[PDB]
Amino acid sequence: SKYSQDVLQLLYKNKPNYISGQSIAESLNISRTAVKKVIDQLKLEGCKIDSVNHKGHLLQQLPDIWYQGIIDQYTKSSALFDFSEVYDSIDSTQLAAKKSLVGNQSSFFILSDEQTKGRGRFNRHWSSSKGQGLWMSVVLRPNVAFSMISKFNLFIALGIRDAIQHFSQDEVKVKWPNDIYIDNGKVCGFLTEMVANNDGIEAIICGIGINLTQQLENFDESIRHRATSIQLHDKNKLDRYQFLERLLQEIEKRYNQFLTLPFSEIREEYNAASNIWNRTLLFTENDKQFKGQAIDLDYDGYLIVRDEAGESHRLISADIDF
Amino acid sequence: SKYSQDVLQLLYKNKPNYISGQSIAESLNISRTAVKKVIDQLKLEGCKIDSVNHKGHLLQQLPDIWYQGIIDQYTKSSALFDFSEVYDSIDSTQLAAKKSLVGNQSSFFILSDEQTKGRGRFNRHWSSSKGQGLWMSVVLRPNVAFSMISKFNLFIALGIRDAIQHFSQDEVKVKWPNDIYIDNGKVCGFLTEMVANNDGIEAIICGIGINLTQQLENFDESIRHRATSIQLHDKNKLDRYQFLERLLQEIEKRYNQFLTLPFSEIREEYNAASNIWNRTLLFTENDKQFKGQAIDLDYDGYLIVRDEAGESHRLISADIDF
Ligand SMILES: C#CCCCC[C@@H]1SC[C@@H]2NC(=O)N[C@@H]21
Numbered sequence: 001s002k003y004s005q006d007v008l009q010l011l012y013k014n015k016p017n018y019i020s021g022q023s024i025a026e027s028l029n030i031s032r033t034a035v036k037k038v039i040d041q042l043k044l045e046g047c048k049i050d051s052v053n054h055k056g057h058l059l060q061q062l063p064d065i066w067y068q069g070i071i072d073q074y075t076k077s078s079a080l081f082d083f084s085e086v087y088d089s090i091d092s093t094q095l096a097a098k099k100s101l102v103g104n105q106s107s108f109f110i111l112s113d114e115q116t117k118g119r120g121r122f123n124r125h126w127s128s129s130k131g132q133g134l135w136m137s138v139v140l141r142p143n144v145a146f147s148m149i150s151k152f153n154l155f156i157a158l159g160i161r162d163a164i165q166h167f168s169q170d171e172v173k174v175k176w177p178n179d180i181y182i183d184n185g186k187v188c189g190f191l192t193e194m195v196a197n198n199d200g201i202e203a204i205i206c207g208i209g210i211n212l213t214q215q216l217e218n219f220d221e222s223i224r225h226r227a228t229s230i231q232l233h234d235k236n237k238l239d240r241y242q243f244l245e246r247l248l249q250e251i252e253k254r255y256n257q258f259l260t261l262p263f264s265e266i267r268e269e270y271n272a273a274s275n276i277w278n279r280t281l282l283f284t285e286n287d288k289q290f291k292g293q294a295i296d297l298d299y300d301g302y303l304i305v306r307d308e309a310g311e312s313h314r315l316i317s318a319d320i321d322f
Numbered sequence: 323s324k325y326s327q328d329v330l331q332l333l334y335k336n337k338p339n340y341i342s343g344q345s346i347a348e349s350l351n352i353s354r355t356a357v358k359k360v361i362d363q364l365k366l367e368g369c370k371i372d373s374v375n376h377k378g379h380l381l382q383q384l385p386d387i388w389y390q391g392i393i394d395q396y397t398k399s400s401a402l403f404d405f406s407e408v409y410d411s412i413d414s415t416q417l418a419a420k421k422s423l424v425g426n427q428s429s430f431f432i433l434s435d436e437q438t439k440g441r442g443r444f445n446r447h448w449s450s451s452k453g454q455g456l457w458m459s460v461v462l463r464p465n466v467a468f469s470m471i472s473k474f475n476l477f478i479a480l481g482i483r484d485a486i487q488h489f490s491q492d493e494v495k496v497k498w499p500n501d502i503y504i505d506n507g508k509v510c511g512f513l514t515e516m517v518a519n520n521d522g523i524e525a526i527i528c529g530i531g532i533n534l535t536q537q538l539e540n541f542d543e544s545i546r547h548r549a550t551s552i553q554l555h556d557k558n559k560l561d562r563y564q565f566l567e568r569l570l571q572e573i574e575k576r577y578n579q580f581l582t583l584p585f586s587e588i589r590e591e592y593n594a595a596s597n598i599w600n601r602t603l604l605f606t607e608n609d610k611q612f613k614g615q616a617i618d619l620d621y622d623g624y625l626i627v628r629d630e631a632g633e634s635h636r637l638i639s640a641d642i643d644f
């Protein structure tokens with residue numbers, strides 16, 4: 001109903017104490033019995049709410065669905081983000097963000113349970129199944145030159161990697177400049193875009209797609225060997241809200257470092273997290289393809305590559321296949 | 323009515339011959355007498371249409387109003403632009419374009435008779451009065467790295483300057499990197515923005531504001547001495563459609579050169595058109611201001627400046643006051 005989010009919000013707000021129907025009913029100025037129907041609905045949708053006579057209701061566990069109601073709490077208490085928008089299904093959180101940023105200087109992020117037109121780099125199709133990944137776009141407002149985009153993109157990587165690590169028992173590595181892996185499985189893709197002019201950046205839009213709970217069964221047949229989910233490397237149930245919380249916190253930490261540190265500060269760190277070394281990398285550039293080794297990430301985030309013909313290259317970006 | 327643009331379109335399409343009401347009536351499958359009411363309305367709005375018994379109607383002169391009807395002809399016959407959108411009044415053609423470009427690869431432009439929230443660089447207020455200027459945003463789709471924005475911005479300048487020249491008896495000069503002048507009056511401001519990622523530009527959005535027909539009386543009192551309009555330097559009535567036609571043609575020419583020539587090809591040309599030489603320029607950078615001379619535009623479009631303390635600078639952009 002009209003009030004599901006409101007009741008959910010109250011339950012989350014009130015943890016770890018119980019609140020009575022009566023009490024919710026008065027907050028919302030709605031009948032006790034309406035509160036009871038909304039509570040039954042939340043249980044039907046898979047909310048885990050303990051209900052005890054006299055005492056009331058306690059939100060125990062959210063299902064794999066995003067609720068504006070709850071996400072609003074993450075934005076109320078946040079220093080970076082003005083608001084968020086949450087959707088059950090949309091063409092793409094990236095398209096939404098690029099539209100929603102126009103005409104304002106808000107910082108915000110967009111989450112959706114599913115995307116019908118999810119896209120990564122080069123307009124490639126990104127699978128965004130309902131129930132199974134965090135499909136998010138983050139719009140921030142750094143006061144910097146447009147060439148700093150590549151820098152943003154390196155700091156944010158380590159933020160994303162750190163959040164995924166906190167949940168996986170296995171080793172999580174960045175594949176420069178835009179992908180995160182656990183062993184041979186891509187568990188995340190991200191994409192930093194900007195709106196900018198010569199005088200600086202109007203907005204950064206970072207689209208982040210992370211596979212949360214797919215079982216292997218769930219992956220398209222061709223990609224099965226090179227794909228994975230945080231679930232498949234975590235002993236406990238992975239809780240999306242718990243993860244989002246961690247992800248937002250890391251983004252903020254890395255975004256602050258992005259504003260205050262030169263790349264050289266995190267370069268070693270980035271280096272150690274990266275999985276592109278000591279191995280033959282396939283590179284694509286327009287028509288061309290060639291093989292190569294990654295020699296180094298210079299102090300400006302450029303990849304130093306020694307190609308199969310012995311020539312050296314200095315790349316701000318690339319698409320690498322393993 | 324529902325058909326004004328349609329009838330207008332037919333009149334423009336049919337120049338320099340007359341078409342009868344009957345003939346319009348059959349094209350549109352509407353009554354002769356409805357055609358007559360729509361023709362009276364167009365005359366009321368200030369269209370100059372010669373109407374002769376037996377023979378029909380001939381569009382002689384459009385008023386200072388943009389008509390989707392006519393602009394559609396400019397897009398039908400165009401090699402660069404997929405469509406246009408025309409508005410009588412909007413917050414900003416720049417805001418519209420940044421929204422309208424999302425999710426597609428169309429090239430297009432947006433015109434509006436008036437803007438209620440026109441903005442130039444640094445979110446500065448740009449006056450966009452109904453009836454008096456061309457307030458346009460142009461979205462193009464160059465397949466290039468994001469650092470090429472500054473290059474785009476230099477080629478487009480000369481396109482804009484060339485169109486304004488064709489109509490002014492006086493000398494039209496560019497004030498790098500974003501303004502056009504006739505003597506001491508700014509007659510145009512433009513602004514190149516981009517949407518981009520590390521792999522290249524998704525869209526260029528060039529907002530162009532050009533004062534067409536202001537009399538001095540029309541300019542805010544403070545700015546009167548440093549502002550001007552193409553009208554105030556043209557002996558003939560300035561015809562906005564005629565100008566738009568010229569502007570679109572120049573944009574296309576300079577956009578083609580942008581895709582095919584290095585800056586060094588047009589640098590001399592740019593140099594000769596520029597009005598920033600042999601004079602004390604005031605510069606703003608954040609908190610700072612300082613005075614300076616423009617020594618040179620290097621081969622990469624960077625301004626070489628000798629500041630008042632004798633130090634040299636190499637600037638991709640600046641805001642200069644005379
Ligand atoms: C291919 C590939 C991985 C690129 C990351 C996709 C994220 S999902 C949320 C946001 N929305 C998109 O359409 N793309 C980004």
Ligand SMILES: C#CCCCC[C@@H]1SC[C@@H]2NC(=O)N[C@@H]21
Binds near residue numbers: 450456513
């Ligand atoms: C200050 C100043 C001049 C910047 C140019 C304004 C053009 S008008 C059409 C387009 N729409 C805008 O809001 N800005 C651009």
